[PDB]
């Protein structure tokens, strides 16, 4: 099989903005999540060709990864923090549904999700 095209990171039809909340999320990604011990499976779109994962894109129809999220944040793709939070939720859920409960990679995703949720709790005023 082949890889699908990656998710879009810009779109001329979608309103764009830079906000304090979105800049906070970008900081969290660059300073903490990207550099995390468990970031490695989540930094780029899953390369099903390189990893020879024939089932991945049969199962995952809404792929999402931190490389895409980071690029969206850098490109002001989002209108609000909730849109970005939704992409993280998609990323974590994808891991949970492709893999099996208790798998090492699932425990990694759970740890990163826990940390992300702590960071969301500290999302600034505006
Ligand atoms: C997020 C998710 O659910 N995935 C589905 C399962 C999966 C994923 C990766 N990812 C991955 C693997 C290796 C490397 C790597 C090794 N060396 N270098 C330079 C890079 C990078 C990766 F991102 N492995 N696996 C499986 C394959 C065997 O056991 C885990 C993604």
Curated annotation (Swiss-Prot):
There is a cross-link at residue 58 (Glycyl lysine isopeptide (Lys-Gly) (interchain with G-Cter in SUMO2)). Signal peptide: none annotated. The NET domain mediates interaction with a number of chromatin proteins involved in transcription regulation (NSD3, JMJD6, CHD4, GLTSCR1 and ATAD5). The C-terminal (CTD) region mediates interaction and recruitment of CDK9 and CCNT1 subunits of the P-TEFb complex. It is also required for maintenance of higher-order chromatin structure. It comes from the Eukaryota. The gene is BRD4. Changing residue 99 to A: Abolishes binding to acetylated histones. It is found in: Nucleus; Chromosome. It comes from Homo sapiens. The record marks 99 as: Acetylated histone binding. It is linked to Cornelia de Lange syndrome 6: A form of Cornelia de Lange syndrome, a clinically heterogeneous developmental disorder associated with malformations affecting multiple systems. It is characterized by facial dysmorphisms, abnormal hands and feet, growth delay, cognitive retardation, hirsutism, gastroesophageal dysfunction and cardiac, ophthalmologic and genitourinary anomalies. CDLS6 inheritance is autosomal dominant. A chromosomal aberration involving BRD4 is found in a rare, aggressive, and lethal carcinoma arising in midline organs of young people. Translocation t(15;19)(q14;p13) with NUTM1 which produces a BRD4-NUTM1 fusion protein. JQ1, a thieno-triazolo-1,4-diazepine derivative, and I-BET, a benzodiazepine derivative, have been tested on tumors with success. Treatment with GSK1210151A (I-BET151, a I-BET derivative) has strong effets on mixed lineage leukemia and promotes myeloid differentiation and leukemia stem-cell depletion. Interacts with p53/TP53; the interaction is direct. Interacts (via CTD region) with CDK9 and CCNT1, acting as an associated component of P-TEFb complex. Interacts with RELA (when acetylated at 'Lys-310'). Interacts (via NET domain) with NSD3, CHD4, BICRA and ATAD5. The interaction with BICRA bridges BRD4 to the GBAF complex. Interacts (via NET domain) with JMJD6 (via JmjC and N-terminal domains); the interaction is stronger in presence of ssRNA and recruits JMJD6 on distal enhancers. Interacts with NSD3. Interacts with NIPBL. (Microbial infection) Interacts with bovine papillomavirus type 1 regulatory protein E2. This interactions may serve for the tethering of viral genomes to host mitotic chromosomes allowing successful partitioning of the viral genome during cell division. Phosphorylation by CK2 disrupt the intramolecular binding between the bromo domain 2 and the NPS region and promotes binding between the NPS and the BID regions, leading to activate the protein and promote binding to acetylated histones. In absence of phosphorylation, BRD4 does not localize to p53/TP53 target gene promoters, phosphorylation promoting recruitment to p53/TP53 target promoters. This is Bromodomain-containing protein 4.
């Amino acid at each position: 099989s082949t890889n699908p095209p990656p998710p879009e990171t810009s779109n001329p039809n979608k309103p764009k903005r830079q906000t304090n909340q979105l800049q906070y999320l970008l900081r969290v990604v660059l300073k903490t999540l990207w550099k995390h011990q468990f970031a490695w499976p989540f930094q780029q779109p899953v390369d099903a060709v390189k990893l020879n994962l024939p089932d991945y894109y049969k199962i995952i129809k809404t792929p999402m990864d931190m490389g895409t999220i980071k690029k969206r944040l850098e490109n002001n793709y989002y209108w609000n923090a909730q849109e970005c939070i939704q992409d993280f939720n998609t990323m974590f859920t994808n891991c949970y549904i492709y893999n099996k409960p208790g798998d090492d990679i699932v425990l990694m995703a759970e740890a990163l999700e826990k940390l992300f949720l702590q960071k969301i709790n500290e999302l600034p005023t505006e």
